[PDB]
Amino acid sequence: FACKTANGTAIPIGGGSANVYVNLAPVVNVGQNLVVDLSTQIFCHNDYPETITDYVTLQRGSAYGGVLSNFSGTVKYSGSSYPFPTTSETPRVVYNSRTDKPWPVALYLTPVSSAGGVAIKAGSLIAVLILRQTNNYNSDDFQFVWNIYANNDVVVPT
Ligand SMILES: OC[C@H]1O[C@H](C/C=C\c2ccc(-c3ccccc3)cc2)[C@@H](O)[C@@H](O)[C@@H]1O
Ligand code: NI
């Protein structure tokens, strides 16, 4: 089991960490959502699907910087929604193919009223998403850690 991002770093077999940059709507109001869909960026595959089934969970979702102080959130994982920051590890998604398949994670972030001005800084860390992979074959239990960085400023009026 291994993961990569669209253009492009990878995390090899056995886990590790990578940094991911995301484009954000540059203006969001109180009551509107920022959607950060990571499923178009993080792709995973099973290296031996004929004998092994890989199980993948969102172990933990944590907020940082601007998002942590100026936004409230949920995360959508494989159809289901959860508070973001997360309060527990999710159910699992099966990976049973050598073909790259998206990691189906999306954040929905909404400004709290105390946000005004630049509520997320360009280049700043906004979130960490930990992917936990196990299988039905041996005791492999690995974390793939995605550090999420803002590409651009996000302003909340006025
Ligand atoms: O993505 C599937 C598996 O890929 C790798 C497997 C690591 C060692 C391994 C490799 C091949 C075989 C194997 C089994 C049957 C036939 C041929 C090879 C068994 C273990 C590891 O990432 C496992 O964690 C993961 O479950
Ligand atoms: Ni591979």
Author numbering: 1 to 158
From the article:
The adherence of UPEC to the urothelial surface is mediated through the mannose-specific lectin FimH, the natural ligand of which is the mannosylated glycoprotein uroplakin Ia present on urothelial cells. Mannose-based FimH antagonists compete with this interaction and prevent bacterial adhesion and hence infection. Two ligands are decorated with a para-biphenyl group on a C-linkage to an ethene spacer (CcbP) or to an ethene with a branched methyl spacer (CtbP) and one with a naphthyl group on a C-linkage to an ethyl spacer (CN).
In this case, two monomers were present in the asymmetric unit. Furthermore, in one of the two monomers the terminal biphenyl group can interact with the lipophilic amino acid Pro26 and is thus presenting an orientation that is well defined by the electron density. CtbP (trans) and CcbP (cis) can accommodate both open and closed conformations of the tyrosine gate formed by Tyr48 and Tyr137. We found that the linker-associated water molecule is shifted away from the C-glycosidic linkages compared with the O- and N-glycosidic linkages and that another water molecule could come in to assist in hydrogen bonding downstream of the C-glycosidic bond.
